[PDB]
Structure formats: structure tokens, C-alpha cells
Amino acid sequence: GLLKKTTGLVGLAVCDTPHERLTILYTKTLDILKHFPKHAAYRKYTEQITNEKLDMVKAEPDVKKLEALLQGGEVEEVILQAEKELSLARKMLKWKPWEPLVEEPPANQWKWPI
Amino acid sequence: ASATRVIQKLRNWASGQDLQAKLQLRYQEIAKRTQPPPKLPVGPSHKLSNNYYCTRDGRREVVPPSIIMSSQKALVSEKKAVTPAPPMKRWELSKDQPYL
Amino acid sequence: MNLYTVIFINILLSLTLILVAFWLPQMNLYSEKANPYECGFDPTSSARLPFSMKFFLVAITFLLFDLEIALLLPLPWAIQTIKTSTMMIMAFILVTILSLGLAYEWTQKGLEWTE
Amino acid sequence: TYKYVNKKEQESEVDMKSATDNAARILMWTELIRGLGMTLSYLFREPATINYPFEKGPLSPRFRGEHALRRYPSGEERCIACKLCEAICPAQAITIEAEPRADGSRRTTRYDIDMTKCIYCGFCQEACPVDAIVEGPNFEFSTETHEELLYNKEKLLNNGDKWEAEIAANIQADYLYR
Amino acid sequence: TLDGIKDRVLYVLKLYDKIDPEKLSVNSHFMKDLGLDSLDQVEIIMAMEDEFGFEIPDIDAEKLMCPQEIVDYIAD
Amino acid sequence: TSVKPIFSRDLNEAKRRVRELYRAWYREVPNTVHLMQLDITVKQGRDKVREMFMKNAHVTDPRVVDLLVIKGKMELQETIKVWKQRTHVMRFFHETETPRPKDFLSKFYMGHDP
Amino acid sequence: KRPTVRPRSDVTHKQLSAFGEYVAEILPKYVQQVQVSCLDELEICIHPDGVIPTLTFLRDHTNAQFKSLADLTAVDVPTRQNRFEIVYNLLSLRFNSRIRVKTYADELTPIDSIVSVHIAANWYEREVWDMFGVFFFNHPDLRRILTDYGFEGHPFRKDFPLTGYVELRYDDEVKRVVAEPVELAQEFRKFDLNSPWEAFPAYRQPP
Numbered sequence: 001g002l003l004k005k006t007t008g009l010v011g012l013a014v015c016d017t018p019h020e021r022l023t024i025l026y027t028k029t030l031d032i033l034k035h036f037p038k039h040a041a042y043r044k045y046t047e048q049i050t051n052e053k054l055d056m057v058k059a060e061p062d063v064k065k066l067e068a069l070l071q072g073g074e075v076e077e078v079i080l081q082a083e084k085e086l087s088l089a090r091k092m093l094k095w096k097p098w099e100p101l102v103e104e105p106p107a108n109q110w111k112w113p114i
Numbered sequence: 115a116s117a118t119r120v121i122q123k124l125r126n127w128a129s130g131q132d133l134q135a136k137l138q139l140r141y142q143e144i145a146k147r148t149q150p151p152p153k154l155p156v157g158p159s160h161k162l163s164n165n166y167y168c169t170r171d172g173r174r175e176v177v178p179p180s181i182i183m184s185s186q187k188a189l190v191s192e193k194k195a196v197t198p199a200p201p202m203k204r205w206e207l208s209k210d211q212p213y214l
Numbered sequence: 215m216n217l218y219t220v221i222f223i224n225i226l227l228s229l230t231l232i233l234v235a236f237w238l239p240q241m242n243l244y245s246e247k248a249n250p251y252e253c254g255f256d257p258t259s260s261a262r263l264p265f266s267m268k269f270f271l272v273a274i275t276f277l278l279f280d281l282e283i284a285l286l287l288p289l290p291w292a293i294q295t296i297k298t299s300t301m302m303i304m305a306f307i308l309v310t311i312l313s314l315g316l317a318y319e320w321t322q323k324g325l326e327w328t329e
Numbered sequence: 330t331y332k333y334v335n336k337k338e339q340e341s342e343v344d345m346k347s348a349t350d351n352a353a354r355i356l357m358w359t360e361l362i363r364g365l366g367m368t369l370s371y372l373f374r375e376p377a378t379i380n381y382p383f384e385k386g387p388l389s390p391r392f393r394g395e396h397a398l399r400r401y402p403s404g405e406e407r408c409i410a411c412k413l414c415e416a417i418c419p420a421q422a423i424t425i426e427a428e429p430r431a432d433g434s435r436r437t438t439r440y441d442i443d444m445t446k447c448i449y450c451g452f453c454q455e456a457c458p459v460d461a462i463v464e465g466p467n468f469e470f471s472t473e474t475h476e477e478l479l480y481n482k483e484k485l486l487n488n489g490d491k492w493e494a495e496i497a498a499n500i501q502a503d504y505l506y507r
Numbered sequence: 508t509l510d511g512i513k514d515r516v517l518y519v520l521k522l523y524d525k526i527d528p529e530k531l532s533v534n535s536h537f538m539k540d541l542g543l544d545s546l547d548q549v550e551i552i553m554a555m556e557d558e559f560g561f562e563i564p565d566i567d568a569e570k571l572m573c574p575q576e577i578v579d580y581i582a583d
Numbered sequence: 584t585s586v587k588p589i590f591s592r593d594l595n596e597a598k599r600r601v602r603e604l605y606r607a608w609y610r611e612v613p614n615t616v617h618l619m620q621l622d623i624t625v626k627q628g629r630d631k632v633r634e635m636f637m638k639n640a641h642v643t644d645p646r647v648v649d650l651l652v653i654k655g656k657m658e659l660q661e662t663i664k665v666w667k668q669r670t671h672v673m674r675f676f677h678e679t680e681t682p683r684p685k686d687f688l689s690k691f692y693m694g695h696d697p
Numbered sequence: 698k699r700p701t702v703r704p705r706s707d708v709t710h711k712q713l714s715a716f717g718e719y720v721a722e723i724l725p726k727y728v729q730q731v732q733v734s735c736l737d738e739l740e741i742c743i744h745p746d747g748v749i750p751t752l753t754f755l756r757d758h759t760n761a762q763f764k765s766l767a768d769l770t771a772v773d774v775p776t777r778q779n780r781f782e783i784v785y786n787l788l789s790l791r792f793n794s795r796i797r798v799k800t801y802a803d804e805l806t807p808i809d810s811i812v813s814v815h816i817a818a819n820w821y822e823r824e825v826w827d828m829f830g831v832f833f834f835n836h837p838d839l840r841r842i843l844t845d846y847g848f849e850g851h852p853f854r855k856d857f858p859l860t861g862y863v864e865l866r867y868d869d870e871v872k873r874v875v876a877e878p879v880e881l882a883q884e885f886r887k888f889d890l891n892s893p894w895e896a897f898p899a900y901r902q903p904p
């Protein structure tokens with residue numbers, strides 16, 4: 001439609017070309033989650049999410065309808081969240097959160113009242 | 115209240131708007147200081163019958179918190195993704211004064 | 215000598231006043247009241263240290279503009295000359311030159327401060 | 330619902346008239362003459378101040394100030410040393426030490442209030458079951474000594490015998506609410 | 508340069524105010540015969556850094572245990 | 584036994600940091616008696632440093648030593664800067680507290696305390 | 698329907714239990730004891746090694762945008778050997794929800810810091826170190842905030858006296874605000890208020 005000269009949030013630019021940056025970021029997430037093992041849950045859930053949002057992008061070209069379908073505020077907030085999820089995916093690849101529990105606690109640790 | 119009708123005019127012009135009606139002080143339009151006695155009302159649970167504290171206790175209807183994935187016990191944590199709640203629906207722009 | 219007298223009178227007023235201010239009252243001196251303020255706590259260093267000035271270019275051009283004032287100021291006598299065209303052109307040139315210099319400084323961000 | 334406070338709807342409509350108006354706002358300080366006129370208007374209003382010692386601020390019966398130990402109309406001392414005014418006092422300002430009076434009566438041998446710990450909260454008078462200690466209207470009991478603001482039974486009873494003519498009325502006015 | 512360091516260091520020692528130099532020598536250990544714990548040795552090493560004009564770490568300082576080792580250090 | 588470290592594999596690697604801290608204090612005292620006009624000599628300031636060090640020489644846990652080093656660095660920061668005033672520094676010396684009698688019979692003459 | 702008691706819903710409880718299963722099965726290397734209370738406040742409990750990964754997850758994950766730190770507390774319980782229960786209250790602003798991440802510590806078992814995730818945690822970690830004595834790794838400043846500069850002690854520890862061990866007053870002999878030991882003209886009067894009767898059978902501890 002138009003270029004929405006003012007996104008209401010401060011410090012956030014406008015991204016004259018959306019429907020591309022989101023494809024980039026979601027494809028990158030999908031391509032990095034392949035390195036996760038299958039039994040991991042972050043892989044599955046993030047794949048579900050990114051596939052749904054990628055389908056939303058492929059479907060709707062209008063930025064306003066895309067926002068209202070893609071409940072993340074303005075499209076620039078959604079793009080920021082995609083970048084940040086990508087960063088998280090790398091960090092989780094390094095951390096290996098899916099492993100079993102390390103050093104279960106003493107018994108009287110979360111028991112309350114005491 | 116006493117402004118001799120020309121100083122009233124001066125202040126209402128320099129200000130920009132009538133202030134003899136909307137004054138900073140209080141003369142006689144205030145609730146006076148000695149009043150009649152009240153009769154304060156009485157809330158429910160004064161029913162005199164069919165009112166037992168075991169039925170309308172709140173402080174006892176609590177429970178210890180429910181538990182998922184306790185390492186102590188043997189609890190176990192296709193499955194669709196989840197949110198802590200549905201997304202907070204966007205706010206609508208005002209109608210009485212949207213652009214101040 | 216009238217003017218000298220007026221100024222001496224004002225001088226002696228000020229000095230007599232300071233003499234009164236110092237030798238009339240009472241004194242209770244001690245090191246904890248005679249040390250610099252700095253808002254309840256003590257200073258972390260001396261005040262006789264560099265205070266970076268961030269308008270020094272503005273100061274220097276103020277000096278040059280002061281000289282421009284000194285050059286413009288003879289005009290009330292320059293106007294009672296017979297020519298009244300050479301002085302016009304020359305004052306025009308002086309003021310226009312000063313304005314040109316101001317504009318160059320402005321555009322080159324000399325009137326802005328050194329952040 | 331929300332609304333913008335400093336967001337222009339849209340720009341880019343200017344003609345020589347609007348330019349003249351803006352250039353006259355500038356170069357005449359027109360939006361500053363309004364401030365001058367406002368302060369001038371305030372010069373010609375009735376000031377809100379009062380000749381304090383001779384005319385004073387309005388208070389209500391609920392106002393809670395200096396303390397007092399009250400009596401019954403018979404003159405009997407009204408406290409009974411039930412010792413919960415100090416249970417609830419969240420500053421630990423009150424002390425009591427109690428004994429039988431040789432008449433065979435629950436009464437105090439001590440009622441102190443460090444009025445430098447009191448926070449003037451009213452909990453003591455809304456906890457007393459007999460309306461014995463109250464928080465009265467006097468707010469003009471400043472002192473030149475810390476030791477004067479540490480009260481005992483006799484000072485509180487002096488306050489009560491002094492301010493009963495006011496406290497009885499304040500209580501009569503405010504009860505049916507408490 | 509070498510043998511000036513000897514009496515230089517030894518004068519610093521003499522001024523240290525806690526060693527009583529009647530026992531003192533260049534091969535004199537600090538811990539055993541003089542009974543100076545690590546902090547006194549650290550003070551000594553600072554006195555040497557004050558005599559000269561080069562900083563030095565604590566590992567070298569703890570490798571040092573007598574004035575002769577100090578002298579051997581100032582070369583390198 | 585079988586516990587985690589903080590900054591120290593062993594006690595010798597903690598004494599290293601201890602000596603670095605003693606060094607910083609020794610080199611700071613002459614500047615603190617000068618900047619804020621203390622009325623002591625540099626000798627007894629450094630003796631106070633060694634006293635407040637030997638107040639904790641019995642310790643052998645590396646973790647406790649590291650935490651004490653941390654708190655010493657905090658106090659050194661506060662003292663290198665003038666965040667703390669002459670009052671706080673001369674607080675160390677106890678220039679008003681009479682000496683606690685370390686003798687039986689004196690304690691018996693004044694007080695029921697041991 | 699009863700007026701005096703507080704109303705009750707179930708959809709919030711179910712949502713938060715679902716999200717608790719979510720976190721529990723997505724982050725098993727660290728998570729212990731997810732729980733949801735009568736009042737619906739989700740509360741995840743975490744191994745201290747999992748702090749940065751869990752907080753980064755809840756900040757940056759799409760279905761959990763907990764990108765605002767509200768509080769960062771600590772709670773001293775002298776009974777348990779790992780005394781200090783540390784708490785992280787968060788909110789999302791995308792789902793209009795809160796969550797609570799919890800860890801545990803001790804006097805000599807510190808925790809990684811969170812300025813790499815939430816810059817708001819700087820002064821809170823400083824406060825926690827000052828009040829309870831929990832050191833935080835790779836923190837920029839980590840000095841006191843609230844206590845006086847020359848102050849020994851971690852006051853909000855339960856074993857610390859309310860009145861302290863030092864008291865201040867000015868002295869003419871030295872012209873300073875010296876610190877004398879503590880000597881009060883009126884001892885704090887401890888009151889023994891707890892009743893000897895089980896008020897709430899639901900929390901009854903068996904032997």
C-alpha cells in the first residue's frame with residue numbers, strides 16, 4: 001500500500017522492503033535448525049512457528065493485513081523478533097539445552113513453607 | 115469575588131478566558147463543616163441465618179501450588195506450540211481526542 | 215577631579231563596608247567550615263585543574279568582532295565629512311565582510327561547541 | 330484506548346499567510362506575551378495566603394495529632410492496661426507497666442509514648458476497646474528539648490483534662506463511621 | 508652497574524626499619540634466619556622498585572628470597 | 584570436599600591475588616593521606632593495612648579468600664576514589680573506643696560478660 | 698459467586714500449565730519443579746548454571762517474549778544448605794503475562810550475571826550482593842549501593858540483627874562522625890505472636 005512514514009516506536013526504522021527480510025530470516029532459522037538433533041523440542045516448535053509465519057508472508061502481500069494476521073505489532077517488530085530468534089538458535093546450538101538434568105538439587109530446596 | 119469588574123476584565127483578557135466562574139478559592143460552594151449524623155449500612159454475612167463461615171471462607175480455599183516436572187518425583191515434563199496467553203490485542207485509537 | 219572624587223567616595227564606601235563586615239561580627243574558625251563546599255561531601259580533586267572550554271573558537275572570533283566594533287565606532291564623526299560616499303561604501307564593505315566571515319564560521323560549524 | 334500527544338497528522342501545506350503568521354510568532358515573541366499576560370492576571374487575583382496565628386487552616390474531626398489519655402464522666406481513669414495499643418504500635422512507641430490499684434482494679438503504673446517514634450497513625454485509638462487513648466487536634470506542641478517529647482501517664486492525662494472539650498466533640502462527630 | 512646494585516639494595520634493606528642489619532648479608536635468606544613473612548618480602552620488593560624505575564610482578568618477587576637473587580634479577 | 588571454585592584452583596593462586604591487593608593498598612596509602620587531609624602518618628596507615636590483613640590469616644578455604652579479596656578491591660576502589668570521606672577511613676583505627684579489656688579480673692570488676 | 702472471597706477462573710491456570718510443560722520439555726538440562734499456584738502465577742525453578750540460557754530463551758523466544766525485568770530479589774532461608782533463593786520476575790507485553798524464574802545459591806556458590814541479557818539487572822545484582830552476599834560473575838561494577846561505604850555486613854540475611862553492630866554519633870575530640878558500638882536506650886521488644894493452632898490444614902506438614 002504505502003510506506004508508513006512513522007512507525008510509532010522510537011529507534012525503529014521502517015524497512016521499506018518487507019516480505020523479503022522475513023523470508024530471509026525465517027529461511028535462515030529453518031536452515032540452522034537442521035543442525036539441531038531430531039529429539040530436541042526447540043527444533044520442532046521453532047520449525048512450526050517459522051513455517052506458520054512464512055506461510056503468512058507468502059499468502060498476504062499487504063503490510064496491514066500481514067500485521068493483523070501476524071500478531072507481533074508492526075512488521076519491524078516482527079523482523080526484530082526474527083533476528084533475535086535466529087541469534088537464540090545459534091546460542092542454543094552452543095548451549096545444548098536438550099541434555100538431561102544436571103545435578104538435581106537437595107530435597108529441602110523448593111519445599112515451602114518450611 | 116471582589117474584583118471591581120474592570121480588574122476582572124483585565125485578568126480575564128490577559129489570561130484568555132473567564133475565570134470568575136472557575137476560581138482558585140472557595141467561598142460558599144463547599145460542603146459545610148458540621149453535618150448531620152449518618153447511618154452506615156451493613157454488608158452481607160449479616161444474614162442472621164444460612165450464613166456459616168465454612169461456606170464463605172476464602173482464606174481456606176487456597177491449596178499448595180500445582181506441580182509439573184518435579185525432579186523429585188517421576189513426572190514427564192505433534193504437540194502443537196504454546197503461548198503463555200493469546201497475544202495482547204492491539205489498542206484502538208481514541209475517538210474523543212485522538213490527535214491532541 | 216570631580217570624577218576622581220566620586221570614584222574615591224564609592225571606593226571608600228566599599229572598603230569601609232568590608233571592614234565593618236569583617237571586624238564587627240564574631241568568629242569561630244575551624245578547618246571543617248573553611249574547606250570547599252562540594253555539597254556535603256569532600257572534593258575528589260582540586261578546582262585549579264583544567265576546565266576544558268568548548269567555545270574557544272567562538273571566543274577568538276568574539277575578539278575579532280570586538281576589533282570590528284572598534285573600527286565601526288568612529289562612524290558618528292565619519293558622517294560629518296563632505297564625501298558621504300566613500301564612508302558609505304567602506305562601511306558597507308566592512309559590515310559585509312564581517313557577515314561573510316560569520317557565515318563561513320557558521321557553515322563550517324565553528325559556532326557549534328566541541329562535544 | 331490511546332492517543333498521540335505530539336504527532337502531527339500530516340505536514341506540507343504552507344502559503345505566504347501561514348509563513349507570515351509563523352514569522353510573526355517569531356520576531357514578536359507572541360507566545361511569550363501570553364505567559365506575561367498569565368502572570369499579570371495572577372498579580373490581580375486574591376492571594377491564597379492566611380495570617381496564620383490569627384487565622385488558620387481548616388481541619389476535620391478525624392485529624393490525628395497530639396495524644397491524650399481520657400477519663401469517664403465520673404472522672405475514673407478510662408485505660409485498663411489491656412496492652413494492645415503497644416502490640417499494634419508499628420514504631421514501638423508505647424510502653425505499659427500495670428498493677429492492681431489497691432482498689433482492686435486493672436490500671437496502669439506507666440503509660441509512656443516516645444513521640445519521637447510515633448508516626449501518628451491512629452492504630453492505638455482504633456484498637457483501644459474503651460476509647461481511652463486518642464489522637465487529638467493539637468499540632469502546635471513543638472519543643473526546644475528532646476526530653477520534653479517523651480511523655481508519660483501524667484502528661485497524657487494533662488492533655489486529656491485539657492482537650493476533653495474538643496475530643497468529646499470530635500468523637501461525637503466521627504463515630505457512626507468507626 | 509653490577510656491584511653498585513649490591514650495596515644499593517643493601518642500603519635499602521638497612522633503611523627497611525624492621526630487619527636490624529647486624530645479622531644481614533647478601534646471601535641472607537629472609538624466611539629462615541630473619542623470620543619475615545611474605546608481606547614483609549613484598550615491602551622489600553617495593554623498596555627495590557622504588558630504588559629502580561621498573562615494575563615487576565609477584566611471581567618474580569616470590570622467586571626472590573635473598574639480596575643476591577635480587578641482584579641477579581636486576582640484570583635480566 | 585567436592586565443591587566448585589571461584590577464581591582460584593588452590594590456595595597459592597589465591598595468595599597471589601592477596602599479595603597483589605596488599606600491593607595496591609601499600610601504594611595507595613600515601614595518596615589517601617594527601618588527597619583527603621588525614622592527620623596520620625603513612626607508617627601507621629600501612630600498619631593498619633597489615634593488621635586488617637592478619638585479622639583473617641587463619642583462613643584456608645580458597646573461596647573465602649577470594650571473596651575477601653573481592654571486598655578488599657571494593658574498599659580499595661572506594662578509597663582510591665573519594666566516594667568515602669575521612670570519617671570512613673579513620674573508622675578503621677577506632678580512635679574513640681576504649682580498649683576491650685582482654686583480662687578476667689577487669690571484666691569481673693565491670694560487667695557480667697565473659 | 699460468593700462476594701467476600703476472590704473470583705476464580707481456570708483458563709489462565711490451564712494456559713500457564715501448558716506453557717510450563719513447554720519450558721520443561723524444551724529446556725530439560727536446567728529446569729526443576731515447574732508449578733502454578735491457586736492465584737495463577739507461573740513459577741519455574743532452575744539450576745544456577747541455567748540462568749543465562751533460560752533468561753535469554755524467555756527474552757528472545759517468539760512464543761515467550763519476556764523482555765522486561767520487573768524484580769530480581771533474594772530470599773534467605775537458613776534451613777536449607779543453599780540459603781539464598783533468587784527470583785526473576787518478568788513480563789512479556791506481547792501476551793500480557795508474567796513468569797517467575799528461580800534459582801538457588803549459597804555464600805560460596807555464586808551465579809553468572811545477566812547484564813548480557815537484561816541491563817536492568819545491574820543495580821539489582823548489586824543490591825543482592827550488598828544485602829545477602831551473593832557474588833555475581835562477569836558483572837561490570839558490582840559494588841555496594843545501599844549500605845554505607847565503610848560497612849561490614851549483609852543486613853537482609855536472617856542471621857543479621859535488626860539494629861546492627863555499629864552506631865554513629867559526632868564527637869568533639871576528633872571532630873568526626875565516629876562509629877561506636879551499639880547501645881540502645883530501649884531494647885526492641887520481640888513479641889511472640891504465632892498461635893499454637895493449625896489454621897490451614899491444607900499446608901499441614903506430616904512428621
Ligand SMILES: CCCCCCCCCCCCCCCCCC(=O)OC[C@H](COP(=O)(O)OCCN)OC(=O)CCCCCCCCCCCCCCCCC
Nearest residue numbers: 351352353354355356357358359360361362363364365366
Ligand atoms: C523599512 C524596511 C526596513 C525595516 C527593517 C525592520 C524589519 C522588522 C524587524 C523585526 C525584528 C524584530 C526583532 C526580532 C529579534 C528576535 C529574532 C528571533 O527570531 O527571536 C529570537 C529568539 C528565537 O526564538 P526561536 O523560536 O527559537 O526561533 C529561532 C529559530 N532560528 O526568540 C527570543 O529571543 C526569545 C528569547 C528571549 C526571551 C526574553 C524575554 C522577552 C520578554 C518580552 C519583553 C518585551 C519587552 C520589550 C520592551 C522593550 C522596551 C525597550
Ligand code: SF4
Nearest residue numbers: 408409411412414457
Ligand atoms: S488499648 Fe486502651 S485500655 Fe488498652 S492499654 Fe492501651 S490505652 Fe489502655
Ligand code: SF4
Nearest residue numbers: 418447448450451453
Ligand atoms: S498513632 Fe500509631 S505510631 Fe503513634 S502511638 Fe498510636 S499506634 Fe503508635
